[model samples]
Target: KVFGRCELAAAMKRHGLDNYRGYSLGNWVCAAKFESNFNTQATNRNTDGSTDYGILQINSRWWCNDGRTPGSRNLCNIPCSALLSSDITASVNCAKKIVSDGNGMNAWVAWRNRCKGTDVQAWIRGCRL
Candidate 1:
């Protein structure tokens, strides 16, 4: 889905993800931007032969099962296709579960590489959420 920043922020906030798991809302928003640019259908095939899914770009390794990839942990217990939808309810819930288990937003490579140490204020700039 193509969401304006504020629109995404409001949706995420309504899902209680604005400050979920001790991470700031900006963190989530920044991760989404770098991961998938708010496109829920986004998918990226990795060199390791696995794929990332949805707006959060969750991987097939430990999160969701894409069926084509084997040896998946599937910790999220969700089909990879489920994360590809624009609704994002499932994706957001799964992300919360991931952060709870892993290193907060560090579970996302985009957060670690791109969003980390950056001024994420623009992520929520001018938003009415």
Candidate 2:
């Protein structure tokens, strides 16, 4: 959670956000609260025994979301190294690519006004991980 907090805070900070309460007031935080319950070591293990590793909950095998194309075997689901890197900023940037891309701050902005709710727990998940 601390790692995510640092990462999320840095990302939002770059966009002028320094409020912890503002973070608690947004979907990303709410999502994190629900998804991993603020646990960074929390990981998902599929029935087949493959893993969806560390913070950001990315599945290594399905990292790139593409079919088995030529030379795409290692296509990252946000490379573990990136997510597990030395810098929070770099990790969050990688996260933006895997999850928020074009809609980064705008999506967060929209969520604050239109996507927030008291039911943050139930609203944070979409996949097996």
Candidate 3:
């Protein structure tokens, strides 16, 4: 599913992303936009034999097990396939685990480059969260 910007914001808020780890809902929404354009089925393969999956683009190298990523940590203890569904529960949950690892939202490169130190609140502007 490709969610509208505000729609994605609301959904993510429901999943407890707002103010998570001191990163606001807007920060998460912004990262999702750059990472996957809010598409639940988005996937990106990297040169390091790893893959990024789902709306937030969780990585197979450390977060999820894709079976193909060499030396995967699978810290989220989820199959990478679980991240590709429109039901974003697993994706959001895995993302929470990723953030809790002390890296915060910086775990995602997109977030670091695009959302970090920016007015991320703009990402959720007008959303009735």
Taking every candidate in turn, the Cα RMSD to the unseen true structure, in Å, is 1.0, 9.3, 0.8
Q: Rate the local accuracy (lDDT) of all candidates.
A: 0.88, 0.43, 0.91
Q: What is the C-alpha lDDT profile of model 3 across 1-129, one tens digit per residue?
A: 999999999998999989988888999899999999999999999989899999999989899999998887998898999999988899999988899998888889999998889999999888887
Error of 1 at 97 (Å): 1.1
The TM-score leader among the candidates is 3
Error of 1 at 129 (Å): 1.1
Q: Show pairs that collide, candidate 3.
A: none
TM-score of model 2 vs. true structure: 0.45
**Between candidates 2 and 3, which one is better according to TM-score?**
3
Q: Report how far residue 116 has shifted in candidate 2, in Å.
A: 7.7
Per-candidate clash tally:
0, 1, 0
Winner of 2 and 3 under lDDT:
3
Candidate 2 scores a C-alpha RMSD against the true structure in Å of: 9.3
TM-score of each: 0.95, 0.45, 0.97
- Point out the worst 10-residue segment of candidate 1 by lDDT: 18-27
Residues 1-129, model 2: lDDT tens digits: 344544543454464333333433245555444444445555665555445444445444545332322233334444444444334443344445544344433333334454465554333233221
